[PDB]
Subunit: 255 residues, 2 copies
Amino acid sequence: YEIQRERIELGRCIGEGQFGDVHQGIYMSPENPAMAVAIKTCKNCTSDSVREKFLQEALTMRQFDHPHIVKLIGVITENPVWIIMELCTLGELRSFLQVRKFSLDLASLILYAYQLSTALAYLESKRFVHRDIAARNVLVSATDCVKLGDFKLPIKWMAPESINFRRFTSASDVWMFGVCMWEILMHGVKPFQGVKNNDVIGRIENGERLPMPPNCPPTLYSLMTKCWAYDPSRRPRFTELKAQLSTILEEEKLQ
Amino acid sequence: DYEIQRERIELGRCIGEGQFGDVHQGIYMSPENPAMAVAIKTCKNCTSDSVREKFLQEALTMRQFDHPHIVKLIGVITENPVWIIMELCTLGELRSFLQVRKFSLDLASLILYAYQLSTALAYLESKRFVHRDIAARNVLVSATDCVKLGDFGLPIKWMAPESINFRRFTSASDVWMFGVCMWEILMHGVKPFQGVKNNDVIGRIENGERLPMPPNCPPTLYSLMTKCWAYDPSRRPRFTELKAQLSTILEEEKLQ
């Protein structure tokens, strides 16, 4: 998986990332003389602790093979350290939804939720807990294809047990996925806008929930609500979510 | 000291045409350290000695400064045609960056840019340097979380009333212009006084009118802008204070 620097041509900055900017580029590879790729960069990679955390993402990504999870291509482990990944040419999901707010139909939004559920059901099948499911970590490969893209605390996305006791489980992932579904159906608006992070848990405990997005099918909002059961053992698993989302999507396409 | 031989520079693509010269990207191969990406500003052959001198002055001015949010001078080529060699900010001009990436740039990024520019301007104020053209058009983007003041040398829509009325420029008039620059940032690169005639701006200022609060701009940040636009220059804050206040506003946004 080590790639010689000389085989990479660093191109335009596509977006921000957790450890540094993400660029598009070309990988002049033996299998392909001009492969379009994404290049994740890392500021402060001269620090051993930062470099270790950055590259741990690559190792994680390498364990998975799913159509809706971004694939690792390689790494450059000399300074400046780079991760080379599959390029998703339409970029970050939040910006895509905001820009295309009045161009994207409901069926497309439901499709993106369904596709992410397939990825998350696969991760569940491997007993992998993600801990940071949110629209900001989803990438858009085509107008009909999104991928999970990324493997201080995102309080506004977190299950109550995660906020209170730092417990992250398959059940807390479902809570977060509910918030991600809300975000999609809101065309990339963040949850709890105008609320301080410290006040979020109090509202959740008081039984308050994100409201039904405009134009959201009632069946879909109901599914969101199930993801936000206070008691984690009452939340659905991803097999159920995937199945229900498939039905909802087909219903919507029959419109 | 800062002279470089033209052979050490490989001129690349033009990234900005201009009246008396153009801006290019390129590569600098230093005898000590190969190899460096750079920005090259070129003076046209037909440019007057007077305007040529301004090019050299820009480099001379830039070389006096050492700050993380001010573009660095690498060197100059004094033999005609004059080229000025500077640090390369790869994401380019701030206005274009704000307009194009509007929907990828959340409020914390916009506040960060204002804060970073305030640190650059506090540093210039510490050197008793008066800039005279603070505007988003003169800011470059080095990374998605790093902007730099990039240029040191008719912008009536940005100018303090004393600068319009009297051609007086001081540290206080810089603060006025910085307020306008903040407004531009929070407006994702919209110019101030769009569709308004230069000759009408002063009439509106003296009448008490000011640019309106941008959508999603925190009221505390707009209050800062409004302080920058005190008609009396002696009532404007200095950049040390603006920097401190912007740090507070940035922290408050991060708590959300």
